[PDB]
């Protein structure tokens, strides 16, 4: 059972997938390969809830039917500068324009 | 192996190289370091293109039931222009 | 006419199974290769139907004639019923290109008289008014 | 030269439906004895081959989306070996049971289509044989001894 995720921090979004049996620390490990930051410098989030490095992704909520390839679940990432952990900050995507007239019902 | 696709508004999307090569345009944009800038595709469009890359690689040649790829009406036209440019 | 049914007269019990979110239009090609519409299938419904061996079927979105797949391919041909088992015709969505899926959505939101009022390149006007049609798709498969 | 095959179809179908209580609505000169001869010749066919008449009235399975194929399938097989007068009588009699069974299954709009297909097949696939064999006038006198 595979979940599909967007790991997001500031203006960065990682499109990756993992298993439900996979754990949050294992997800911090694949972040390390991509962003070159060890897991001890990583805080992961689902909405505003820090994820334990031992909880499986299914326990946090990431299931097959809430993390699909066409609608992937969002995981917040926060890095540690030196001693202090940075607060989670995610810049939103741009907004679409107003719906043109010939497309309005 | 991943690739960084950068939208017009500066958003950086880190997708697998295999997924991004769904687009023949992105294929040539990388074959001429592992980055490419889309000066014309905003982040709300480019994020949806990357979801299609995941969706396409997941369900192509898959015997299981295939879900619809959803497209909200407010992004449909912009996404079409992007799909036409990227050829995917 | 290489894409036609064969008048075998040998019955073939088939189960049309709609594993797609679309309302499916079963299309039978008669012995001259002309497509004939059959009753539609709501999403997620199945029908045990009476067909014949060597016949040709294809499956479409009943509203927009978008092409669909049947057992992961273009056309379905009923075969011999072994052990009293019916033949399954699992009808599913294909993986449309992003462009085609976008063309589907824009078509569903814009009247064809207003395609050319959209602020897009002139090539996309042609693509929008190039609606999917069984006839032209039948002739493509013929040259294969 | 020739007769209007459309009127021959309309007059015959209107007669075949009246034999079961149905009145038919929506819809070069042909003599009167041509129509009345096809009536008796058709009713004679059906009594002589009531086995084939019965199995045909049963195994029609008419729906609006199969009626066209059913007609062409039976008519192609009927004249597969060739055309003669008895098979032309069976042709009208087959078109009769399709109109009857159409109204039985509450599919009366199909009667108009069946009449159109019968007229098409006559003007297109039987007219050469009919006129090369004395026309309908030759047919009335082949059945003459039976009236």
Author numbering:
A (entry chain B): 1 to 105
B (entry chain C): 17 to 48, 57 to 112
C (entry chain A): 61 to 204
D (entry chain D): 7 to 33, 87 to 206
What does the report in the manuscript say about this coordinate set?
Overexpression of BCL-xL and BCL-2 play key roles in tumorigenesis and cancer drug resistance. PROTACs are heterobifunctional molecules comprising two different ligands connected via an intervening linker. The ligands are specific for an E3 ligase and the target POI, and formation of an E3/PROTAC/POI ternary complex leads to K48-polyUb formation and proteasomal degradation of the POI which otherwise would not be targeted for ubiquitination by the E3 ligase. 753b is a VHL-based PROTAC and we were interested in elucidating the molecular basis by which 753b induces targeted degradation of BCL-xL/BCL-2 through formation of VHL/753b/BCL-xL and VHL/753b/BCL-2 ternary complexes, respectively. For our structural studies, a complex of VHL, Elongin C, and Elongin B (hereafter referred to as VCB) was used as the E3 substrate receptor subcomplex, as VHL is unstable when expressed alone.
